[PDB]
Amino acid sequence: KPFTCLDGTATIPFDQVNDDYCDCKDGSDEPGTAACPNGSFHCTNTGYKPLYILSSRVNDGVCDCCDGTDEYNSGTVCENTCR
Amino acid sequence: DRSNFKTCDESSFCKRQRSIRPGLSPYRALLDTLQLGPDALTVHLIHEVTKVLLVLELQGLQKDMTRIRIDELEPRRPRYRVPDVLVADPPTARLSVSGRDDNSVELTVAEGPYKIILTAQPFRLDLLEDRSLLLSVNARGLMAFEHQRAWEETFKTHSDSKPYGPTSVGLDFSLPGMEHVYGIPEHADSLRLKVTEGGEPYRLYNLDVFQYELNNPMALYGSVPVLLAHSFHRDLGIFWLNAAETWVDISSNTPQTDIRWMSESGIIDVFLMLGPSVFDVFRQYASLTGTQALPPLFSLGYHQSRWNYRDEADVLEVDQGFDDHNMPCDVIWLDIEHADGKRYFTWDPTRFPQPLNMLEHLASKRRKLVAIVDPHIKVDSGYRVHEELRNHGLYVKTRDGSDYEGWCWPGSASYPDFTNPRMRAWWSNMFSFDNYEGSAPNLYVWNDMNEPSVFNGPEVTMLKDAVHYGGWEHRDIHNIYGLYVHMATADGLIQRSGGIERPFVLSRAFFSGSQRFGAVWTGDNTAEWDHLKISIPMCLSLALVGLSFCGADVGGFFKNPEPELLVRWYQMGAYQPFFRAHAHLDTGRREPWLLASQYQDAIRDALFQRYSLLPFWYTLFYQAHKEGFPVMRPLWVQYPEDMSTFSIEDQFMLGDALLIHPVSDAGAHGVQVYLPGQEEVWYDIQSYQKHHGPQTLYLPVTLSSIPVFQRGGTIVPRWMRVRRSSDCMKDDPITLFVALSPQGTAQGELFLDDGHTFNYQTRHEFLLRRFSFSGSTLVSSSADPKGHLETPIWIERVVIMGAGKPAAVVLQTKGSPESRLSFQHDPETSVLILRKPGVSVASDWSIHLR
Ligand SMILES: O=[N+]([O-])c1cc(-n2nccn2)ccc1NCCCCCCN[C@H]1C[C@](O)(CO)[C@@H](O)[C@H](O)[C@H]1O
Ligand SMILES: [Ca+2]
Ligand SMILES: [Ca+2]
Numbered sequence: 035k036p037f038t039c040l041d042g043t044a045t046i047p048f049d050q051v052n053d054d055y056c057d058c059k060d061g062s063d064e065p066g067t068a069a070c071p072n073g074s075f076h077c078t079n080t081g082y083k084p085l086y087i088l089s090s091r092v093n094d095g096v097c098d099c100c101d102g103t104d105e106y107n108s109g110t111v112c113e114n115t116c117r
Numbered sequence: 118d119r120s121n122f123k124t125c126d127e128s129s130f131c132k133r134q135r136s137i138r139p140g141l142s143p144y145r146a147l148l149d150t151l152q153l154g155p156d157a158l159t160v161h162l163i164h165e166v167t168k169v170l171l172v173l174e175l176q177g178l179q180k181d182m183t184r185i186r187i188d189e190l191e192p193r194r195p196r197y198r199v200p201d202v203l204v205a206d207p208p209t210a211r212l213s214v215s216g217r218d219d220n221s222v223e224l225t226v227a228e229g230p231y232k233i234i235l236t237a238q239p240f241r242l243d244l245l246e247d248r249s250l251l252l253s254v255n256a257r258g259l260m261a262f263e264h265q266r267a268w269e270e271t272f273k274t275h276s277d278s279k280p281y282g283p284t285s286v287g288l289d290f291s292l293p294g295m296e297h298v299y300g301i302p303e304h305a306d307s308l309r310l311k312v313t314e315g316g317e318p319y320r321l322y323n324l325d326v327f328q329y330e331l332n333n334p335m336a337l338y339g340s341v342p343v344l345l346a347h348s349f350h351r352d353l354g355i356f357w358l359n360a361a362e363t364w365v366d367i368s369s370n371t372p373q374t375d376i377r378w379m380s381e382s383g384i385i386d387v388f389l390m391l392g393p394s395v396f397d398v399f400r401q402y403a404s405l406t407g408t409q410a411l412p413p414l415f416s417l418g419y420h421q422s423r424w425n426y427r428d429e430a431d432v433l434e435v436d437q438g439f440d441d442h443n444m445p446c447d448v449i450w451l452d453i454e455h456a457d458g459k460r461y462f463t464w465d466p467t468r469f470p471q472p473l474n475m476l477e478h479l480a481s482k483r484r485k486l487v488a489i490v491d492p493h494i495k496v497d498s499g500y501r502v503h504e505e506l507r508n509h510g511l512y513v514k515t516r517d518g519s520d521y522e523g524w525c526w527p528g529s530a531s532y533p534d535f536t537n538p539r540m541r542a543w544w545s546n547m548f549s550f551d552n553y554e555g556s557a558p559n560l561y562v563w564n565d566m567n568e569p570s571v572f573n574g575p576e577v578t579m580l581k582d583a584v585h586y587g588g589w590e591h592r593d594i595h596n597i598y599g600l601y602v603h604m605a606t607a608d609g610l611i612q613r614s615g616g617i618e619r620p621f622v623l624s625r626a627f628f629s630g631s632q633r634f635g636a637v638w639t640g641d642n643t644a645e646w647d648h649l650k651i652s653i654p655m656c657l658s659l660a661l662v663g664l665s666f667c668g669a670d671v672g673g674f675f676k677n678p679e680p681e682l683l684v685r686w687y688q689m690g691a692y693q694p695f696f697r698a699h700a701h702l703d704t705g706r707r708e709p710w711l712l713a714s715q716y717q718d719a720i721r722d723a724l725f726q727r728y729s730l731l732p733f734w735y736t737l738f739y740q741a742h743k744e745g746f747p748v749m750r751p752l753w754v755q756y757p758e759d760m761s762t763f764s765i766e767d768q769f770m771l772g773d774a775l776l777i778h779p780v781s782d783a784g785a786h787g788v789q790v791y792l793p794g795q796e797e798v799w800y801d802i803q804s805y806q807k808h809h810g811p812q813t814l815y816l817p818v819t820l821s822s823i824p825v826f827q828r829g830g831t832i833v834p835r836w837m838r839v840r841r842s843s844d845c846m847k848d849d850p851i852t853l854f855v856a857l858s859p860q861g862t863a864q865g866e867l868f869l870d871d872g873h874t875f876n877y878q879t880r881h882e883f884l885l886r887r888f889s890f891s892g893s894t895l896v897s898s899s900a901d902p903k904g905h906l907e908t909p910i911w912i913e914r915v916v917i918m919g920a921g922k923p924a925a926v927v928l929q930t931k932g933s934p935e936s937r938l939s940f941q942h943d944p945e946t947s948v949l950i951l952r953k954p955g956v957s958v959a960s961d962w963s964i965h966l967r
Contacts, residue, residue, distance in 0.1 A: 053953070054913075055952065055953040068838055068840075068849075069913075071838070088443065090838060090840050091840070091841070094483070094840050094841065094845035095483050095844065096841070096845065097481070108848075
C-alpha cells in the first residue's frame with residue numbers, strides 16, 4: 035500500500051516515507067528527518083512531557099529533546115535530562 | 118561640527134601643493150646619469166631652480182605593471198617607505214632602450230607590447246601598448262617633491278612641532294579616454310567619483326567622524342589609495358603606496374581624466390596596473406597586496422549586535438529568542454560594556470562573571486561570540502596589560518621620550534606602537550587561552566577605534582609628531598596603524614589554536630592589504646533611508662580595491678529606524694558580504710522578533726534567503742581568495758561596454774550570477790530594475806519569470822519583496838534546509854538552481870571544506886566542483902583534482918529554469934548503475950524540478966534529460 039499525504043497533495047510509495055527528501059506539501063512524509071521545511075519531529079520523552087520540534091532541528095547537532103532522540107546521526111551524543 | 122576637521126586650505130602641505138597649478142614643470146631628467154640595472158632603470162632628476170637632485174627608479178613588472186619610485190639623491194635623513202603592505206617583492210621584467218633622441222628615451226618592457234617614453238625636459242613619462250597611449254605621468258607639470266631641509270603648525274589647540282619641516286610629495290597622472298574613475302575609499306560618496314575642481318580634494322586619512330554625513334569627500338575611518346579607471350575600451354588602475362595623509366584631485370577635460378595625489382611625507386611610490394580588462398587589474402593588484410582572507414563559514418552568516426547587551430543572562434535570552442522565533446543567527450556580539458571599565462581583555466565582574474560558561478552555552482547552540490578589543494590601553498597601574506606595555510617600552514612615545522597619553526573610552530589611555538613587530542608579537546600572544554582568560558575557541562574579535570581615535574587629539578586622532586619604532590613620526594605611518602592592529606589580532610586568533618583555526622576579525626580602520634586580515638564595516642551610519650542607499654556605493658568602492666568582506670550596520674547605528682526601514686535594511690544586508698545588525702547605546706532594542714508579525718515575517722524571509730545562499734557566498738569568497746575577484750560587483754564590471762551601467766549604484770551583482778535591486782524607499786510600490794546584456798536572459802527567482810536584456814523593468818514590490826534575478830547561463834548552489842546557524846547546516850545536501858542561457862547552457866562552481874580551518878591549504882582537504890549544462894545534460898566534474906574531502910553532502914534536488922518537459926531523466930555516476938529520477942514540470946514557468954539525485958557531492962555524475 036502507498037502512503038498518502040495528510041493534505042491530499044500526492045500519494046507516494048512507503049519507500050518515500052522518511053527517505054530524507056520532502057515529498058508532501060505539509061511535510062507529513064518525513065516525520066523522522068530534517069527534510070521538510072514545515073515538518074515536525076515528536077519527542078516521546080518518557081519521564082517528562084512529550085514535545086514537538088521543528089524538523090530543521092533533527093540532527094542539527096543541538097540537543098532539543100530531553101530524551102535526546104532528535105540527534106541520532108549528527109555526531110552529537112545527547113544525554114537524557116527529562117528529570 | 119566640521120570645523121573639527123581640516124579642509125585642504127587648513128592643511129599646510131595640501132595648501133602648498135594645491136597652489137601649484139598646471140604648467141611647465143621645473144623638473145628635468147639628466148639622461149647622462151641614466152643606468153639600466155638588472156631590475157630597474159635609474160636616472161637623476163633635478164629641479165631647474167632649486168638644483169635639488171632626485172632619483173627616479175623605473176621598473177617594468179611581470180603581469181603588465183609599471184612601478185615608479187622617486188626619492189632624494191642625497192637625503193639628510195631617510196624617507197619612509199611603506200612596509201608590510203606588499204605581500205612579496207614584485208617580479209620584474211627587463212627594460213630595454215628601443216629608441217632615443219636628445220630629449221627622449223623610449224623603453225620596451227621585455228619584448229613588448231608595452232613601452233615607456235621618458236622625456237627629459239620637461240620630465241614626463243608616457244605609457245603605451247604598441248602605439249596606443251595609455252597613461253601619462255606629470256603631463257600637467259604638477260610633480261612636487263619638498264626635500265628635507267635643516268614648520269611649527271597649530272590647529273585648534275593642538276600644536277604640531279613638525280621637526281623636519283615641509284616634506285610633502287605629489288604627482289599627476291593623465292588618463293586619455295577615461296571619463297569614469299572609482300575607488301579611494303573610504304568616503305560617504307557616490308561610486309563614480311566626482312571631479313574635485315570646484316571644491317575639496319578627496320582626503321585619505323583614517324579619522325573618526327562623529328555622525329558623518331553623506332555626499333562629501335571628508336576622510337572617514339579607512340584609506341585605500343587605489344583608483345580604477347574604466348571606459349568602453351580599457352581598464353586601468355593606479356596604486357599610490359603612501360601611508361601619510363593624502364589628498365586626491367580629480368579633473369576632467371578627446372575625453373580625459375587627470376588624477377593628482379598629494380601626500381605629507383614618504384617617497385613617491387606608485388604602481389600602474391595596465392589591465393586591459395578590469396579582471397586583469399584585479400589580478401594585478403592582488404599580486405601586489407594579496408587577496409581576501411577566506412572567512413570561516415560562520416562569519417558569512419547573520420551577526421546580532423548592539424551597544425550593549427547587559428550581562429550573560431541577556432546574551433542567553435537573545436540566543437534563545439532567535440530559536441523561539443525561528444530565525445537563524447551565527448554570532449552574538451559583546452561591545453565595550455562587557456569589559457571591566459573598558460579595560461580590554463577583561464570581563465565585568467558583576468555582569469560577566471563566568472565567560473567560559475556563557476561561551477559553553479553558545480557552543481551547545483553551535484553559535485559564536487565576538488568580543489570587542491580596542492588598541493587604547495587604560496593608564497592604570499592595576500591593569501596588567503598597561504603594566505606590561507609600560508615596562509617593556511612598547512607604547513607610542515612623544516618627542517621627550519615619555520609614553521603618549523590621550524583620552525578615549527576608559528579615560529586617560531596610552532597607545533601601543535603597532536608598527537613595532539615586537540609589539541604585534543606581544544599582542545598576538547595575548548590572545549592565547551592562558552593570557553586572555555575567559556576566552557574560548559568560539560570567541561572572536563572586533564577591533565574598533567584603531568584609526569587610532571584619540572578624543573582630545575587633533576582631528577580626534579594622534580598627534581603628527583608622536584614617535585614610533587625606528588624613530589618614524591606618526592605622520593609617516595598613520596594610515597597603516599589600524600591595519601597593524603587588524604593584522605596582529607588575526608595572527609593572535611590563528612596562533613592561539615596552534616595555527617589551525619581561521620580567524621575572524623572585524624576592523625574599522627584599514628589600508629591596502631587589510632583584505633588579508635578579515636572584514637570591515639562603514640562605521641557609525643544613521644537610521645535613515647539615504648544611509649541605507651549609500652551602503653551599496655560604499656561597499657562597492659571597497660570591493661573594487663580588494664576589500665570584499667564589507668558591510669554597514671543593519672538598521673543604522675544612530676537613532677531608531679521605523680519598522681519598514683528596518684525590514685528594508687535586513688533585505689539589503691542579507692545580500693551584502695558582512696551582515697551585522699548593530700545599534701547605539703541609547704537606541705531602543707531592535708532584535709528582529711520585537712516587531713509586529715508582518716515585519717518579523719519579512720525579516721525572517723530575508724534571513725532564510727541569506728542562509729540558503731551560504732554555499733554560493735562561500736564559493737564567491739573562495740574565488741576572491743584564490744583570484745582576487747570581488748564578491749559584490751558593480752554592473753559595469755560584468756558589462757564593461759554598456760555605458761549606461763558606469764554610474765549605477767542602486768543595483769549590484771554577486772559574482773556573475775545574481776543581480777540585486779533592494780527596495781530603498783519608504784512606501785515603495787515598485788522598483789526600476791535595469792537588466793543588462795545583449796542576448797542575455799534574467800530569471801526572477803521568486804516568480805521564475807524570464808526577462809530578456811537589455812531593458813529597464815518596472816517590478817511591483819510588497820514589504821516582503823527582495824528583487825533578485827539569476828542570470829541565464831549560471832548555476833547557483835543552495836542549502837534549502839535552513840537551520841539555526843551555519844554550523845548546523847554544513848553537512849546538509851545541496852540544491853542546484855540551473856538558469857539556462859538562450860543557447861540552453863549553464864555553468865557554476867562550488868567550494869566545500871570543513872568550514873573553519875586552514876586544512877584546505879595545508880592538507881588540500883576541500884572540494885571544488887564544476888557543474889555544467891549543455892545540450893540536455895548536467896555534468897558534475899572536478900574543477901581542482903588536488904582537493905579531496907570526507908563529507909556527507911549530497912545533491913538532493915536540481916531546479917532548472919527555462920527547460921521543457923523531458924520524457925525521462927537518467928542519472929549516471931561512477932560506481933553506480935544507471936538510475937531513473939522522477940521529476941515535476943510547470944508548463945507556465947518552464948521550471949523543471951529533478952527529485953533526489955542522491956549522489957555525493959564528491960562524485961562525478963551526469964543527468965540526462967531525454
Ligand atoms: O568629539 N569626540 O570624539 C568625543 C569627545 C569626548 N571628549 N571630549 C573631551 C573629553 N572627552 C567624548 C566623547 C566624544 N564622542 C562621543 C560619542 C561617540 C559615539 C560613537 C562611537 N562609535 C564606536 C564606538 C562603539 O560605539 C562602542 O564600542 C561602537 O558601538 C561603534 O560601532 C563604534 O563605531
Ligand atoms: Ca519523502
Ligand atoms: Ca536537535
